[PDB]
Ligand binder design. Structure first.
Ligand code: MG
Ligand code: MG
Lengths: 431, 431
């Protein structure tokens, strides 16, 4: 059970950019492989990944530095430990780096080891990853937030919001929900190609048609739901990622809906906008509806909509338990988006999920634009009985691999598997 | 060790459509999981993919029948066997099916089992898959045939042909080759974005920029090659998929270059065009140059070009060992695309590859429109020392996964690994 080898290597992510991969071997023969997704090389409160910056190689995006760190620094510091001591190992790697950003060794280097280790252990004990991470009572399959229509900067159309997602809350199981989202996804692709719109896909694997406004985004999605055979009421609901920081002007102090063409709006106006969109559409979740610094505005948004709408904070909290408690106290938002490579280790991730839960908040495990076949976040979702997950559209293996993995979990879980659907929003008092 | 369990389930492929997955366990605990890919379309001579045809579920694309076949028919037949008995097991399933196109049990069902068993056996023997399949002397990393530009039916632009690809033949090792094509893939993306063109990708993770000229696609790549810092003709030769059958006049005997608008062209002059293209541009390989039936025509093309240019037949042979032989007699090609699921079993697959080698033909193991995280075709390329592989662009994990596996393989090989680059074309007299 004692780690006898920790070896990193450079590989590619779903976007053609190098990333790290770590393999841990125990003396018994147990193996574990951790693959890290594309994080950020810069952030004030965000853990930072380590890039080489060699303009001549991979456009400076190589991670030969992080690999070297793992193989020559982290490896010998970890070799000797018992693969099962997750907490102790992450604690060390964190102290070895010695910095909060994990800037010395690199968050990508630390995370790959953290994950490989955990997987190595699961393997050693011959148990599924989700049981090894969360215990015996790990059975609630996440209700997915599926990307379907893209806008803002992740598109070239008239839609200010970054992305529109569908949530199959009316399904009896994850498997059916998956089927539900897939049939809608296709019904829609049909509506677009027949409407003359582009059908190619982006990073999340969703559509980025050139719709005319924001309303034409939700509306077209409603069409697909109905064409697919499901009712927009109970079968499929709506979720969105506004990513308002994108169309927010620090200097002007207002939000500017360029793409939409609706001009500029005030935070009071934006909160009003969301109130209009929510009455006209079955929107259950709004992500980063106000700028990452509008701490005051989020509080108001939370007061008016928080009772019947999930307000998620992505750029707002940056998986930083620090900022999370700041929001919890002030009472801003009621759900946090968890990005593993953004925090750094598995134990820190779990700590965040627990702090969130204890606040009556929701923890939406998430993916990044540059993913890999690794589906560790799916086991995490089930190991913590999170209740939801946001891992992409129903295209591209970098996204499907996570859904296929949830199928297996639901499958090997048998008659004890659970799908809460709408009953997953324990954070929403009113319906 | 005796096979104790053979279990299949319905999962999703990279395009969001259901496919089959099979797990194999042996008495001592060895395990193996095979995932089956799927093509955009299919016809005769191609092993049958069993679909449920239930229009009210996944557009009638569910594979619940095949899942049942493996669990209810195949499992009972194979359990008891020694996981290492590949040939025997693949022969047992073929007979069990009875039909020549595996249409009774389904080629997706059979293949899933075939792959699962072999991987389960490598696991059992604690040896890398490429070694279990091809023996001790497996060390040639494939020269990749990377997708960059798309045309024909796979796009909404001119470009009569449906696929242009780059081949990093000048790199010293597969690792570098991958970096090379990656820098080119991105360099191109920079060019397309700049001149206002679609940066979105297709099934293979390639680009579908709207261009009005077959020659444009060739020259637009030549500049991405150079701007990436590489010298064409030496570091990056070119390969193309014509898929001429798509634009072949069923009635009359001509090819209509509708997309490019060049109008009608006859198989007698199409050869001149291909002979032209290869004159100005660095075209090393042309896939399906003439119609999948214009045999007589292909022959001619093989004489005038087949000694300095690889002519691989995809639709021509459709991974059919019988069609192939015919082509070998007439001398109408010098390379064949290998699509595992198009034939159905790993055994028949290796038989097809060995039969090509003996004819001085090249065996290009390729990916499929609908893929999964599975990278078995990667090990197959090295196991047989094929020398080439066509598994996609440098976007989408359904593609990148295969490349990462190759990275892993080369690494594992160490000092005995080999990358032949241009010299992989043993089928070409002149270079
Ligand atoms: Mg977002
Ligand atoms: Mg073809």
């Amino acid at each position: 059970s004692i780690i006898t080898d920790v070896y990193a290597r450079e590989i590619l992510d779903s976007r053609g950019n190098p990333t790290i991969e770590v393999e841990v071997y125990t003396e018994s023969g147990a193996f574990g492989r951790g693959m890290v997704p594309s994080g950020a090389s810069t952030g004030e409160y965000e853990a930072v990944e380590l890039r080489d910056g060699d303009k001549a190689r991979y456009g400076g995006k190589g991670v030969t530095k992080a690999v070297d760190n793992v193989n020559n620094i982290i490896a010998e510091a970890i070799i000797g430990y018992d693969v099962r001591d997750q907490m102790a190992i992450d604690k060390a790697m964190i102290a070895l780096d010695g910095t909060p950003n994990k800037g010395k060794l690199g968050a990508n280097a630390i995370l790959g080891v953290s994950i490989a280790v955990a997987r190595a252990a699961a393997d050693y004990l011959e148990v599924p990853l989700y049981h090894y991470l969360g215990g015996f009572n790990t059975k609630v399959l996440p209700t997915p937030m599926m990307n379907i229509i893209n806008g803002g900067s992740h598109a070239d159309n008239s839609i200010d919001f970054q992305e529109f997602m569908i949530m199959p809350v009316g399904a009896p199981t994850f498997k059916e929900a998956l089927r539900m989202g897939a049939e809608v996804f296709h019904a829609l692709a049909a509506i677009l190609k027949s409407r003359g719109l582009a059908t190619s896909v982006g990073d999340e694997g969703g559509f980025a048609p050139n719709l005319g406004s924001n309303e034409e985004g939700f509306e077209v999605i409603i069409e697909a739901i109905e064409k697919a055979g499901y009712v927009p009421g109970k079968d499929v609901v709506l979720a969105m990622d506004a990513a308002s920081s994108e169309f927010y002007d620090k200097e002007k102090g207002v939000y500017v809906l360029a793409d939409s063409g609706e001009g500029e709006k005030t935070t009071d106006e934006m909160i009003k906008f969301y109130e209009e969109l929510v009455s006209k559409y079955p929107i259950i979740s709004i992500e980063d509806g106000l700028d990452e610094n509008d701490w005051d505005g989020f509080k108001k948004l939370t007061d008016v909509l928080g009772d019947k709408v999930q307000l998620v904070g992505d750029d707002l909290f940056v998986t930083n338990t620090q900022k999370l408690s700041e929001g919890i106290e002030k009472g801003i938002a009621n759900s946090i988006l968890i990005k593993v490579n953004q925090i750094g280790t598995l134990t820190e991730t779990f700590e965040a999920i627990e702090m969130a839960k204890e606040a009556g908040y929701t923890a939406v495990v998430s993916h990044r634009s540059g993913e890999t076949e690794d589906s560790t976040i799916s086991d995490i979702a089930v190991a913590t009985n999170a209740g939801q997950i946001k891992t992409g559209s129903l295209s591209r293996t970098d996204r499907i691999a996570k859904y296929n993995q949830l199928l297996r979990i639901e499958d090997q879980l048998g008659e004890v598997a659970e799908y809460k659907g709408l009953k997953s929003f324990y954070n929403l008092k009113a319906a």
